[PDB]
Amino acid sequence: TIDMRSAYAWSLASTPFITSINDNTFNANSNTLEYGFKRAKLSWYTIDPVFYSSKPSGISNDDLSLNTTRRIYSRELYPNQVVNTLDLTYYPGERGPYNNNPSFGASNPSANFGGIMRALNSTNFEQGNVEYIQFWVLDPYVGNGESPATNAGKIYFNLGEISEDVLKDGRKQYENGLGPDQVMVNPQPLWGDVPASQSLIYAFDTNPDNRKNQDVGLDGLPSSREGSIYTNYAGEATGDDYTYYLNADGGVLERYKNYNGTEGNSAVSINDPNRGSTTLPDVEDINRDNTMSTINAYYEYSIDVKPGMQVGENYITDIREVTNVDLPNGGTTNARWIQFKIPVSQPQNTIGNITDFRSIRFMRMFMTGFNSQMTVRFGALDLVRGEWRRYVEFDVAAVNIQENGTK
Secondary structure (H helix, E strand, O other): OEEOOOOOOOEOOOOOOOOOOOOOOOOOOOOOOOOOOOEOOOOOEOOOOOOOOOOOOOOOOOOOOOOOOOOOEHHHHOOOOEOOOOEOOEOOOOOOOOOOOOOOOOOOHHHOEOOEEOOOOOOOHHHHOEEEEEEOEOOOOOOOOOOOOOOOEOOOOOEEEOOOOOOOOOOOOOOOOOOOOOOEOOOOOOOOOOEOOOOOOOOOOOOHHHHHHHOOOOOOOOOOOHHHOOOOOOOOOOOOOOOOOOOOOOOHHHHOOOOOOOOOOOOOOOOOOOOOOOOOOOOOOOOOOOOOOOOOOOOOOOOOEOOOOOOOOOOEOOOOOOOOEEOOOOOEEOOOOOOEEEEOOOOOOOOOOOOOOOOOEEEEEOOOOOOOOEOOEEOOOEEEEOOOOOOOOOOOOOOOOOOOOOO
16 A cells, blocks of 8 residues: 555645536636635644643533544454544635635535645556555544535545646746745736745745745735735635634634645744644645646546445445444444545546556545535545556455455
8 A cells, every 4th residue: 555644745736627628616717816716615634632632721522522523543443543534624615715706605515626636656557556546434424423414425536647736826836935025926926926936945944034924825925915816805804824723712623724724834933822734835836846737637536425325336345334432522423434445447537638547646635516514534545556467347456354354
């Protein structure tokens, strides 16, 4: 396997397609700013270990037990010790990051995505023989975290050469090195104040008075001048901000509401009320080639998230139903662990001129098609490379105790 659970290694995503020429989700239309008009406000985060140990002065034991923040033990997944999940708590009514969508109150929240992309460490699935994509999503429709029915999950898995241009600026990349000291593009590049100088090394300074002016998001506007571009949503101070997970107010599912913002995400002097979770610039390079590669060679791998799911369903496998997990307060629920397996050499809606797996990069997530919150918790999301090279739906798994201990 090649683990892919890194909560920090993901980041915002270029807005998708469903076939190379399509404008649903408002994409391949960069002429205007109507590019993130369909973007919800999902988050991604591992519930940090300071909630189950000696707790903060916020959440009590009543919120650590509602099956979206439950401290899944390894025993609970693999009936052979704590499993660090990777949530994707998706908010298809929260306007997400950068977009001045004027109405955003009549459009169906089903027509809003939430983007996340990675940068695969190893290309060329041919040489590596990357066969499957496996993971252990929680069946979200169980006790204490049961989102009501009528969600109709459409988690996509664009696994191609996804456009690394997160915030479509006209092929202008983006970095630190902002402020009045530096120079920017003569016109504001339709989103912000994208600087005019090439990134020598992606890293801030250490002058705390300076870094406070550099990290201003993926726009360049310091959130005090964002009201000049985001006009209709202006006078709300805005498009993006940041809040430390142990600084916000509410349940653990909601403290990670804005623990993905880019503005203030790199505060110096770690012993602050608002830490950063990164000391890296807020740049539009997921792979750090020092370039963007604004291309689209996808391989969609759709998934449904329905109320009920057998094993013969979309790509499901061994479901691993649990019975009575002692929740932290006094309770116990019935959780499900529907494992999936998307065969990588069987795409669905190949976008662009991609033809073979000789070079792959930038896997990408979604949560499109919802109507309320969803907190899909990937127990172990993972590209799993075979080692056996198959020479009638002939297939080759590798049955293991921990995986198929409940086949």
